[PDB]
Design a protein around this ligand. Structure first.
Ligand SMILES: [Ca+2]
Ligand SMILES: [Cl-]
Ligand SMILES: [Cl-]
Length: 294
């Protein structure tokens, strides 16, 4: 069902001298849910219950997000993809995930997750993905309505929009969900970002890291790498397509639809489709996992 209640209890672990928060419920092989910008583990709260008893249900808060510590000192050079990956790699190592992991990814969680999967292919039992960066992007991949704003994030105007005015949390997020969010839902999304300034840095550093039109070169290469790999990997995949969708449409959906050993369903949603179709998404992931774990 829907609802504003978080799933399970937030746990904390020290990683590289910082505290990171995560959900870890149940026993067995992990089903690892990874949020992106500007969300947290909370994004998965109505989806994870569908996987009850099918494995160890894990959802991590990226550094500087959710209940994870902020980086100190924060600035325009902090919260790059490389920095997030260092923290997330270390967190996933510390969680003792074993060698039959199911990944469930979205947004930046998909860049992180696809990259991790490429680097740890022997430990990956299945990949479920939605509204994901399937390959390096181009401006024409962005819906016409969102293109200008993301361009503005990647300019000097970004600090005012995001650090001062919290545009990613307050405008982009609700603007890419079809149903109206409740007071409690927006309160949960707002919470890590209540204060103006550096507290909000992760939500600006992220759009500045998106691999678009060849920049930044490091993230482009990482996505080119996992794009080639995923297009050839026989690892079972679940592609949750969205209507109207937002990111994973047109060219980049044409591309991910070439990936082998892949099941597809379509659900209602724009970008943050977890808020529109959590039961359809959860049911599909649960069925995928059941087939992977007979
Ligand atoms: Ca909306
Ligand atoms: Cl095992
Ligand atoms: Cl972003």
């Amino acid at each position: 069902s829907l609802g504003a209640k978080p799933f399970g209890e937030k746990k904390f672990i020290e990683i590289k001298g910082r505290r990171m928060a995560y959900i870890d419920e149940g026993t067995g092989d992990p089903i690892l849910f990874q949020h992106g910008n500007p969300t947290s583990s909370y994004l998965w709260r109505n989806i994870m219950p569908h996987c009850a008893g099918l494995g160890r249900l894990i959802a991590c808060d990226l550094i500087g997000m959710g209940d994870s510590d902020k980086l100190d000192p924060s600035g325009p050079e902090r919260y790059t993809y490389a920095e997030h990956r260092d923290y997330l790699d270390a967190l996933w190592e510390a969680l003792d995930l074993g060698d039959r992991v199911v990944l469930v990814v979205h947004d930046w969680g998909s860049v992180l997750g696809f990259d991790w999967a490429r680097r740890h292919r022997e430990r990956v039992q299945g990949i479920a993905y939605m509204e994901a960066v399937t390959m390096p992007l181009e401006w024409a991949d962005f819906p016409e309505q969102d293109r200008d704003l993301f361009q503005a994030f990647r300019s000097q105007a970004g600090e005012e929009l995001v650090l001062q005015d919290n545009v990613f949390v307050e405008q982009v997020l609700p603007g890419l969900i079809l149903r109206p969010l409740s007071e409690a839902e927006m309160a949960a999304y707002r919470e890590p970002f209540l204060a103006a300034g550096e507290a909000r840095r992760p939500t600006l550093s992220w759009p500045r890291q998106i691999p678009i039109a060849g920049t930044p070169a490091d993230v482009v290469a990482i996505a080119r790498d996992y794009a080639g790999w995923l297009s050839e990997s026989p690892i079972p995949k679940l592609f949750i397509n969205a209507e109207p969708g937002a990111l994973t449409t047109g060219r980049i959906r044409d591309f991910c639809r070439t990936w082998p050993n892949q099941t597809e369903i379509t659900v209602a949603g724009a970008h943050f489709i977890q808020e529109d179709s959590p039961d359809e998404i959860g049911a599909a992931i649960a069925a995928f996992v059941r087939r992977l774990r007979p």
